[PDB]
Enzyme design. Structure first.
Site, PDB file in Angstrom:
ATOM      1  N   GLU A  43      -1.716   7.824  13.001  1.00 60.49           N
ATOM      2  CA  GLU A  43      -1.263   7.230  11.721  1.00 60.49           C
ATOM      3  C   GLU A  43      -2.393   6.540  10.972  1.00 60.49           C
ATOM      4  O   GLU A  43      -2.372   6.444   9.751  1.00 60.49           O
ATOM      5  CB  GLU A  43      -0.137   6.199  11.952  1.00 60.49           C
ATOM      6  CG  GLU A  43       1.167   6.739  12.510  1.00 60.49           C
ATOM      7  CD  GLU A  43       1.968   7.569  11.529  1.00 60.49           C
ATOM      8  OE1 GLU A  43       1.803   7.410  10.296  1.00 60.49           O
ATOM      9  OE2 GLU A  43       2.790   8.374  12.013  1.00 60.49           O
TER      10      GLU A  43
ATOM     11  N   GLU B  41      -2.338   3.242   3.548  1.00 63.36           N
ATOM     12  CA  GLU B  41      -2.136   4.622   3.146  1.00 63.36           C
ATOM     13  C   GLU B  41      -3.135   4.997   2.045  1.00 63.36           C
ATOM     14  O   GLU B  41      -3.349   4.226   1.099  1.00 63.36           O
ATOM     15  CB  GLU B  41      -0.712   4.763   2.607  1.00 63.36           C
ATOM     16  CG  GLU B  41      -0.385   6.155   2.143  1.00 63.36           C
ATOM     17  CD  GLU B  41       1.020   6.296   1.591  1.00 63.36           C
ATOM     18  OE1 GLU B  41       1.883   5.424   1.875  1.00 63.36           O
ATOM     19  OE2 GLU B  41       1.256   7.303   0.885  1.00 63.36           O
TER      20      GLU B  41
END
Length: 204
Positions: A66, A75
């Site tokens: 991730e 992100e």
């Protein structure tokens, strides 16, 4: 008792591969991880030594995937603010609920609930997940234990593959075999470093 299985040396091994220019380097810390682990009863302390090792390996494999190897806090170039209009978890205008932290916590409804558990304002201060190391790791352990089937899967014979299904089921059954392989590769490496057999149902 997680610190008995995952030492400072082991954690530094994982964190150390990240490029120096990674925002996660020196943000994702062993201190923050151990604080987070201890906060959720049962996490990496359920079952036999092999069961505990596989749970922690499964957690870290998904975390490594991730975050690109404990490189990213945020992100990359999020396309939206990740707001689903809600009366229960109202979005704060001007805030983004893009992925943050070890398991890339996303969406107002998840930030709200995480903040309620951990003790911060997830709706009004989602940035805390990218600013406070311990809060950051707590969002990941919280997600693992309280907001998904990850813990239940890895402690009921569903194997690492069950944790992938619990996190992003769209990847399984040929959805994205490259993504599955990324997670699996990390899991096998971490199991090898811990000296535990990866077990059954490794993929999905």
């Amino acid at each position: 008792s997680v610190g008995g299985i995952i030492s400072q040396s082991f954690f530094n091994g994982l964190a150390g591969g990240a490029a120096s220019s990674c925002e996660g380097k020196g943000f994702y810390t062993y201190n923050a991880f151990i604080a987070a682990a201890n906060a959720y009863s049962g996490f990496g302390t359920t079952g036999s030594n092999d069961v505990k090792k596989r749970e922690l390996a499964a957690f870290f494999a998904n975390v490594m995937h991730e975050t690109g190897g404990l490189c990213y806090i945020n992100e990359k170039n999020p396309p939206i603010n990740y707001c689903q209009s809600s009366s229960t978890w109202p979005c704060t205008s001007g805030k983004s609920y893009h992925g943050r932290g070890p398991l890339q916590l996303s969406w107002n409804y998840n930030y709200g609930a995480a903040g309620k558990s951990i003790g911060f304002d997830g709706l009004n201060n989602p940035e805390k997940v990218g600013q406070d190391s311990t809060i950051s790791f707590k969002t990941a352990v919280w997600f693992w234990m309280k907001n998904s089937n990850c813990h239940s899967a890895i402690t009921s014979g569903q194997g690492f593959g069950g944790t992938i299904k619990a996190i992003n089921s769209m990847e399984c059954n040929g959805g994205n075999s490259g993504e599955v392989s990324s997670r699996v590769n990390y899991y096998k490496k971490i199991c090898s470093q811990l000296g535990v057999d990866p077990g059954a149902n490794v993929s999905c």
